[PDB]
Amino acid sequence: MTLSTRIAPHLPYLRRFSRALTGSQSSGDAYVAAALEALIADVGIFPEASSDRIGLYRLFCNLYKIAPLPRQAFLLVAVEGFNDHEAAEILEVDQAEFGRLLSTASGEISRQVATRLMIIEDEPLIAMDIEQMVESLGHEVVGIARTKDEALALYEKEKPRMVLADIQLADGSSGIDAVNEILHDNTIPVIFITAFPERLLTGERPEPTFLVTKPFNPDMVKALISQALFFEEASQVAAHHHH
Numbered sequence: 478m479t480l481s482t483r484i485a486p487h488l489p490y491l492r493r494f495s496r497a498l499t500g501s502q503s504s505g506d507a508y509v510a511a512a513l514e515a516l517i518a519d520v521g522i523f524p525e526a527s528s529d530r531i532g533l534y535r536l537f538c539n540l541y542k543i544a545p546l547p548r549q550a551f552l553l554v555a556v557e558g559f560n561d562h563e564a565a566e567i568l569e570v571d572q573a574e575f576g577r578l579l580s581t582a583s584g585e586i587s588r589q590v591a592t593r594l595m596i597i598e599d600e601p602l603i604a605m606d607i608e609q610m611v612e613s614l615g616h617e618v619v620g621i622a623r624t625k626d627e628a629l630a631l632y633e634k635e636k637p638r639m640v641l642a643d644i645q646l647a648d649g650s651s652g653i654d655a656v657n658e659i660l661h662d663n664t665i666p667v668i669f670i671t672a673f674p675e676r677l678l679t680g681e682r683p684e685p686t687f688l689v690t691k692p693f694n695p696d697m698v699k700a701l702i703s704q705a706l707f708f709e710e711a712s713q714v715a716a717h718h719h720h
């Protein structure tokens with residue numbers, strides 16, 4: 478198999494990482510597309526790594542030099558599924574320096590501004606596991622919506638600051654379409670939940686910025702909430718800066 482076919486299976490997850498790192502689907506996808514066009518132009522730039530996946534993420538991180546280095550470290554382990562040694566190789570740091578980078582991250586990521594959030598999830602055990610993780614971080618669950626109709630009603634009554642939404646509901650209907658109705662009147666951070674993340678990581682049409690895989694490591698949820706609030710704060714500061 479050639480480099481194109483060696484790396485092609487790893488592109489969806491690299492977009493997930495890129496979007497979590499930049500805070501938008503447009504910047505996330507564009508940084509992946511740029512690294513991909515750089516590789517096609519000169520195959521020799523591909524780093525020599527332990528695996529094709531590590532080499533792809535290493536090339537991305539070297540081209541990218543965007544959230545800070547401890548946030549990159551935590552994302553690689555908590556969201557991306559790399560062990561500490563693979564992530565240190567991706568970041569081009571010694572295992573010892575990565576451990577300190579991860580501690581600086583763990584402190585930042587574990588300290589989140591208390592937020593009121595709505596959960597759109599029909600599976601009771603999944604709904605409770607998200608609730609328990611969110612509460613452990615100091616957040617407040619305003620309620621759990623199981624359908625699109627309950628979600629719009631819960632959004633109007635409680636006005637949550639953030640939404641954690643499953644892709645498919647009790648009814649065949651889309652959780653994305655349900656969320657898109659809220660996003661019109663008010664722009665709030667949203668973290669999507671799906672059993673099939675690759676379907677939403679093509680970079681070929683409008684897709685989620687933040688994507689949790691179900692079932693999830695609770696650290697994946699913790700990390701993505703932290704990023705969403707990190708960019709929400711930067712966005713709010715910049716939007717009211719001239720006032």
Ligand SMILES: [Ca+2]
Nearest residue numbers: 716717718720
């Ligand atoms: Ca203002």
